[PDB]
Design a binder for this molecule. Structure first.
Ligand SMILES: Nc1ncnc2c1ncn2[C@@H]1O[C@H](COP(=O)(O)OP(=O)(O)O)[C@@H](O)[C@H]1O
Ligand SMILES: [Mg+2]
Length: 301
């Protein structure tokens, strides 16, 4: 595949840095023909196969091919792709409202009901992806962003498709990648991967959202990975005293070692913490609250 060969500067004015990755810088940009704003993600090509100073073409093409297919309110879309001698440049939907957790940490309080309204949008974005056999594989709080934080109901946008893969029937995918505190045991243990890893990651996100504690984070990388592999976590009363039983059950069904026994996205949407079956369930959720003092501390990390 060949992407657009023109100088991106002919079509866009580039602005400030929005963020960066190992081999990527993301800048705000303005499309000259429309005056509309986008995010330009400049990915460094490795260029020579023996160089470790950039991304392989296969990995860039994969990210691009996944982003091209996706069209859903809770995931970013690809607008255009350009390339020059050094870079592949992805013009992405601009997400301007920062990370979800930073926005939530500015609130005075947050009930589980209010928390689930945000979580539900993540679940909807992932439901979409999984419906197309796309595993995101890098779900973590920093990849959960807000389109615009200054509206009454902020919209979640899942970003960062640098690790995403189409799950292809007939060919096993195994790899070790991603951030130790957020990856599933099958990633840790180099076992067959699928849509299930994302579900684990959602359990981790939810655990942090409610408590301000990371379920598996140890004092070293090696220790974090051992916690994940052993499914060594607790609902510490210091953090979870005001957390509903339905919320803990939601989490418990996601933080499951065997991928085949873990809750699927479709089941997570029907879980009573997400979709209460009666008045009593809806009342618990409303009555329960995020641990805001502790949560605010997490977001500061
Ligand atoms: N569509 C976007 N809108 C606004 N900021 C973005 C967008 N995509 C990425 N960023 C910012 O740039 C950072 C790096 O982008 P990301 O896609 O995460 O790169 P990588 O896959 O190399 O980690 C992100 O953490 C985020 O802060
Ligand atoms: Mg990233």
């Amino acid at each position: 595949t060949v992407f657009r060969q023109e100088n991106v500067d002919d079509y866009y004015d580039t602005g400030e840095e929005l963020g960066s990755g190992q081999f990527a810088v993301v800048k705000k940009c303005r499309e000259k023909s429309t005056g509309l704003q986008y995010a330009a993600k400049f990915i460094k090509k490795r260029r020579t196969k023996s160089s470790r100073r950039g991304v392989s073409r296969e990995d860039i093409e994969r990210e691009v091919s996944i982003l091209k297919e996706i069209q859903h309110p809770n995931v970013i879309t690809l607008h255009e792709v350009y390339e020059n001698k050094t870079d592949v440049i992805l013009i992405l939907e601009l997400v301007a409202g920062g990370e979800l957790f930073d926005f939530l940490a500015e609130k005075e309080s947050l009930t589980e009901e209010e928390a689930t309204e945000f979580l539900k949008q993540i679940l909807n974005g992932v439901y979409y992806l999984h419906s197309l056999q796309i595993a995101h594989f890098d779900l973590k709080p920093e990849n959960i962003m807000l389109l615009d934080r200054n509206v009454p109901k902020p919209r979640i946008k899942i970003i960062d498709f640098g690790l995403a893969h189409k799950i292809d029937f007939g060919n096993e995918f195994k790899n070790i990648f991603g951030t130790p505190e957020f990856v599933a045991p099958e990633i840790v243990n180099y076992e067959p991967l699928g849509l299930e890893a994302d579900m684990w990651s959602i359990g981790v996100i939810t655990y942090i959202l409610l408590s301000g504690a990371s379920p598996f984070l140890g004092d070293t990388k090696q220790e974090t990975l051992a916690n994940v592999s052993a499914v060594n976590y607790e609902f510490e009363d210091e953090y979870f005293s005001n957390t509903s039983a339905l919320a803990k059950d939601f989490i418990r069904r996601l933080l499951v070692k065997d991928p085949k026994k873990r809750m699927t996205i479709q089941d997570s949407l029907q879980h009573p913490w997400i979709k209460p079956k009666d008045t009593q369930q809806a009342l618990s959720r409303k009555a329960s609250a995020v641990n805001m003092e502790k949560f605010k501390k997490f977001a500061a990390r």
